Amino acid sequence: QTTTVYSLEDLLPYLKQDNVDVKLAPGTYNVNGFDVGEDRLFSTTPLFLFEGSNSTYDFTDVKLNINTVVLTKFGNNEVNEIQILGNNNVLKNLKLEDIGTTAPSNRAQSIVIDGRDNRIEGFHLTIRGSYPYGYGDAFGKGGGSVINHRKHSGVLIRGLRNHLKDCTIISRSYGHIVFMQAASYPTVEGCYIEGEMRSTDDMLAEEGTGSPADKVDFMTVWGYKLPAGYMMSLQEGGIRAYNAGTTYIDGVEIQRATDNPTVLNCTIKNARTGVTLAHANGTKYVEGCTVLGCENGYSIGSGTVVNCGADAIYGPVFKNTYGSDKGYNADITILPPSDAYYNGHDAVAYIGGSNHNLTFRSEITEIPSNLKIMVSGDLQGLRVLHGSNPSQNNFAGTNIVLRNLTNFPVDLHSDSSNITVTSCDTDNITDNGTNNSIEAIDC
C-alpha cells in the first residue's frame, strides 16, 4: 500500500494528492541554492506544501539538509520549508537540518501546520539562519525595531487539532522555537525544545567594536539601555501562544486567537519562555513538563499547570502575565539548578490577578539571596523596568492560595490582599498587604 520514492523530485507530486501512503527512502537529501528556480526542483515556497488530505509520509532514516541560502532565493518573501494545508495527515521521523547561518531575505518559519487533525511525529529539526543573531529581542521583535530583524522560527502550529508529538526541535536562530497562531485545540506532546543563552554583560562588552548594538549605544526597544546582570535566550519562546493569527482549513481563511492549547510531557531548555499560553483562550492545560535555564518558566494566564517543574537560574519559574489573570491553578516544582545562577529578575515567582491556587515544591536548600516569591510589587524583570510593558508589572493580587512547600522567602507587597499563605517557614515571609493569612506547615 506504500509507494516508495528515491528523490525529492519524485516525492513532490504526491503532496498534491489525497489518500496516499508514501515513503521517502532512507538516505541523505540536500537542497542547495541551485535547486531553487523556474526549471529547478523548487520553483515556489513553501518548499514542501502538503495540500492533500488523509495521507501518511514516512521519513525514517531520511536526513534532509537545507542550505540556509535558500531563505534568500525567493525575493522579499517569507520562506517556509514545510507547510501542511490538508487534513488528517501524518508526517513521521524526518531529520531536517538547516545548513549554515545565512539570514532570510525577509523571514522564515521551518514548519507551518494549517488544516485539521494533522500530526508531525518523531522529527528532529535544527533551525539556523536569522538576523540579528546574538541579542534576543532587546533591539526589537516586531515593528518599530531598533535593529531590523530577519526572524526564523521553528514550528508554527495553526489550524484545528494539530499535534506535534515526540519531536526534538533545536534552535540556533532568532525566532520562536514552537509557537501557536490561530490554532484551535493544538497539542504539543513529548517534545524536547532547546535554544541557547547569552548574558547581557557579554552583549554590553561589544562596546567600542562597531557592532549593531554598539552603534545604537545598546538602547533597547524597552526604552532604556540594556541592563547588565541578566541571561537572555537567543531564541524567542519555547512554546508560545498568540491571541491572533491566520489559518486555512478546508478552503476557509480564518483569523482568530489560539484556543484550548494542551502541552504534555515536554522539556524546554534555554528559551525566552518555557510555556507561555496567557494569550490563548479556552482551556489551557500543561502537565508533566520540565523547563530548564529559560528566562521564564510558566505563564498560562488561567487554567492548569500540574506535575511540572522549572529551575530558576535565569528567571522566575512562574509569572502571572497581567492583573487580569484569573483562575491560574499551578503545582510547580522548583528544580535543582541546571547551571550557575544568573537571575537578574530578583524573583523566583511573580504573582498577581485573582482566584489562583498555587503550590510550589522544592528540595533546594541553598536559596540565592536575591530570589523570593513575590505577591504584587515591582518586579525587576528585564523587559518591565522603568514603566516598560506596564500592564505586565506592578499589579494587585487578591484571593490567592499560596502553598509554599519550599525554603524560598515570600514578600507580600502592599497591593496584595486576601492571600492565604502556608509555608515551611514563616520567619522569612514579609507581609505588607491587607487581610493576608500566614500559617506554618511541618516540612
Author numbering: 1 to 443
The authors write:
FdlA from Flavobacterium sp. SA-0082 is an endo-type fucoidan-degrading enzyme that cleaves the sulfated fuco-glucuronomannan (SFGM) through a lytic mechanism. Our structural, biochemical, and enzymological analyses strongly suggest that FdlA-NTD utilizes catalytic residues different from other β-helix polysaccharide lyases, potentially representing a novel polysaccharide lyase family.
FdlA-NTD forms a right-handed parallel β-helix, one type of the six PL classes, shaping like a fish skeleton with a dimension of 67 Å × 22 Å × 47 Å. The FdlA-NTD molecule contains 13 coils, with coils 1–6 being complete, while the other coils lacking either PB1 or PB3. The T3 loops at coils 1–9 together with the adjacent PB1 sheets form a 30-Å long concave groove at the surface of the β-helix. In addition to these common stacks and ladders, we also found an unusual cysteine ladder composed of five cysteine residues (Cys168, Cys192, Cys267, Cys290, Cys309) that are located at the T2-PB3 juncture of coils 4–8, beneath the potential substrate binding groove.
